[PDB]
Design an enzyme around this catalytic site. Sequence first.
Site, PDB file in Angstrom:
ATOM      1  N   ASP A 173     118.466  56.583  21.727  1.00  0.00           N
ATOM      2  CA  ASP A 173     118.961  55.302  22.235  1.00  0.00           C
ATOM      3  C   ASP A 173     120.354  55.225  22.807  1.00  0.00           C
ATOM      4  O   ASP A 173     121.290  55.227  21.991  1.00  0.00           O
ATOM      5  CB  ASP A 173     118.860  54.384  20.990  1.00  0.00           C
TER       6      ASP A 173
ATOM      7  N   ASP B  68     120.073  51.555  29.261  1.00  0.00           N
ATOM      8  CA  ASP B  68     119.623  51.592  27.870  1.00  0.00           C
ATOM      9  C   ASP B  68     118.242  52.201  27.683  1.00  0.00           C
ATOM     10  O   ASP B  68     117.249  51.498  27.924  1.00  0.00           O
ATOM     11  CB  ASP B  68     119.690  50.129  27.355  1.00  0.00           C
TER      12      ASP B  68
END
Length: 325
Positions: free
Chosen positions: A35, A218
């Site tokens: 992430d 992201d």
Amino acid sequence: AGVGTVPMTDYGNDIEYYGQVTIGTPGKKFNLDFDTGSSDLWIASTLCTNCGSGQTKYDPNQSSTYQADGRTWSISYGDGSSASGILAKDNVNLGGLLIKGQTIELAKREAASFASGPNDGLLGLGFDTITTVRGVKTPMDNLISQGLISRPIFGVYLGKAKNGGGGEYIFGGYDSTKFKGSLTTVPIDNSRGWWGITVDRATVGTSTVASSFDGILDTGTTLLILPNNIAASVARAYGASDNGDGTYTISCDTSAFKPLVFSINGASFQVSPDSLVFEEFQGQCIAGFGYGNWGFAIIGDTFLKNNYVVFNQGVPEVQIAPVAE
Ligand SMILES: [Ca+2]
């Protein structure tokens, strides 16, 4: 796989991508979500009282390199999920690179969505200014300081389930077989701890649906989430209808759609027609773009599965190119 190379698994219809990481001595394999929108490395553990029976759990007792820590941690992600527990120290093997004495966060509690997901925890690749505990060095910080990578970069390829899935992260390098043409360098704003960039404009056909806007790269977000006005402008271009929950209903037939093109630092990057549809459920299709009440966009998997990105933590900057497909 080569040194620092981590093959990824595409979960479902490009929902998220996880890779195997070995933690401890002799060590256990864990599937972690990679992430770039967060910076904590946390994993399900045997101290957890509401974790999934399917997750692999780190057991301090089975690692001869486990070192206790008196600090606690708690995290709350934007999507409402959360987790909490205690800190610890152990070795982490990322694609053959052994990080010694990495701070790891053992979950004692986690939200139900984590308990039912496919991963055992998360590997945060954002900047260290947003670690939840002050003083924690992230895995990238440690790869650099321990000399495990000679260039402070990681190349990211996210596959499309339609083409077989997969993906691949390379720590300390990149793979030109995954992209076409030349890479475009784009400066990064890490002032909020994220990989922030400026998009010059967005067009659908001949229409300018948006002027410049800021966004964050992201890997941990499924959709392309845009500020309200921008999302509505995009939706109007495709005839999508607002579901009133941050999502849109779009035609399942994308053969007639033009790609959503972003102009970034003078080059074009797009969201291909097939990527405009995220999921199909009982003949209704959910669009690959959504809206949130933020002034910046969350440039998630919808966009990343169409564009290879080289993340450089050192400058900081990114290099982007269209995926080879
Ligand atoms: Ca996520």
